[PDB]
Amino acid sequence: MKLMIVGNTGSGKTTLLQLMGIDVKDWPLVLVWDFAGREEFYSTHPHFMTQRALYLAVYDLSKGQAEVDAMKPWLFNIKARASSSPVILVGTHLDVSDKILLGFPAIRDYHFVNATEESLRKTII
């Protein structure tokens, strides 16, 4: 369960959390979301978490075609949250390797990267 530490900027939130723009920690049940202020707490209304989200669904492409299949449930939950929500599939680990669901969200594009060096970055719109 969650502990949400809310208050205007400057109130003591971060210093209080002595107890042990958004800072999510685990406090050893074991609980902590620490919000800098008003703007940051507003941003996490469920409306925004579901409806103003652009998703990168990232998978490791060198395990095979069961990790494009471990991903279908992600794509199904992404759809449960909001069914119009854009998704960009990215398989990583191109450098190390020898399928793409036409129920699923609006899959915007799909890339094959080596996530480790410069060569997607513009498709992110």
Ligand X SMILES: Nc1nc2c(ncn2[C@@H]2O[C@H](COP(=O)(O)OP(=O)(O)O)[C@@H](O)[C@H]2O)c(=O)[nH]1
The residue among 46 and 117 lying less far from ligand X, judged by its C-beta, is 117
Q: How far is the CB of 83 from ligand X (least distance, A)?
A: 25
Burial class (CB in 10 A: 0-12, 13-18, 19+), 35: buried
Does position 119 interact with ligand X (CB under 6 A)? The reply is no
Does position 63 interact with ligand X (CB under 6 A)? The reply is no
Q: Which two tokens stand for residue 31?
A: 């609980």
From 15-23, 31-39, 49-57, 91-99, span contacting ligand X (CB under 6 A):
91-99
Q: How far is the CB of 76 from ligand X (least distance, A)?
A: 19
Does position 96 interact with ligand X (CB under 6 A)? The reply is yes
Q: Tally the residues of the chain.
A: 125
The edge-to-edge listing of strands for the beta sheet with 55-60 is 55-60, 86-92, 106-112
In the three-class reduction of DSSP (H, G, I as helix; E, B as strand; rest coil), residue 34 is classed as: strand
Residues in the interface with ligand X (CB under 6 A) total 8
For ligand X, the binding residues (CB under 6 A) are 92-93, 95-96, 113-116
